[PDB]
Symmetry: C2
Subunit: 117 residues, 2 copies
Amino acid sequence: GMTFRDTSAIASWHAHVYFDASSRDAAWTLREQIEAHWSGKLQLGRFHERPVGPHPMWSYQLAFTQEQFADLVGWLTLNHGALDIFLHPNTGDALRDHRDAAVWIGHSHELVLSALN
Amino acid sequence: GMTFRDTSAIASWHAHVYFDASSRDAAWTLREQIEAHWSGKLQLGRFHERPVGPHPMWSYQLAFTQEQFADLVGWLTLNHGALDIFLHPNTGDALRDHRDAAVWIGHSHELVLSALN
Ligand SMILES: [Cl-]
Ligand SMILES: [Cl-]
Ligand SMILES: [Cl-]
């Protein structure tokens, strides 16, 4: 049986906007709106135009606190268009968080979990 | 030419825990823990052991506010085990909300879109 955890186990969240060559322009446009809308509320990573790390799509990262989660995730849910977004909590166990605690705005993708740990 | 929306557009959130014959006990355990952890203050629908509405799997519904979103969604992310969970905001447009504002804890599923008419 699984042991239940409290939300205090979550130190922070990462979201990754996924895209590819076909959706690059749309991804860029959303990234500019995130900059415009969320300056100081999250850390925005580089625009990766290849698969990096465990990500099977081109991507960029947003890193944010539990206190920003509802506002930012709600806004992304409303405004993501056709871009899939991968989200996961950071609990101190990268493989477990990616393998077992993946959240998707839009469609899910099979991660490159073998890249972890 | 998307019009960006504010989270004020969201009246409420709805989650649907998906399960099947293979995963009934886990789905039930989760439901009971939801009931206990929020002391019956969330809105819980019927435990459906058949596909209902737009849901291709057996399911049960949870409804909650934007102000409950971070805690509940965090908790579900940590505690869902292998159960996929469909979430969507309610903006008054059931088609658009289900089609375009779907969020999935775990893996995404194709909805039975016919049921949205
Ligand atoms: Cl670099
Ligand atoms: Cl959208
Ligand atoms: Cl979506």
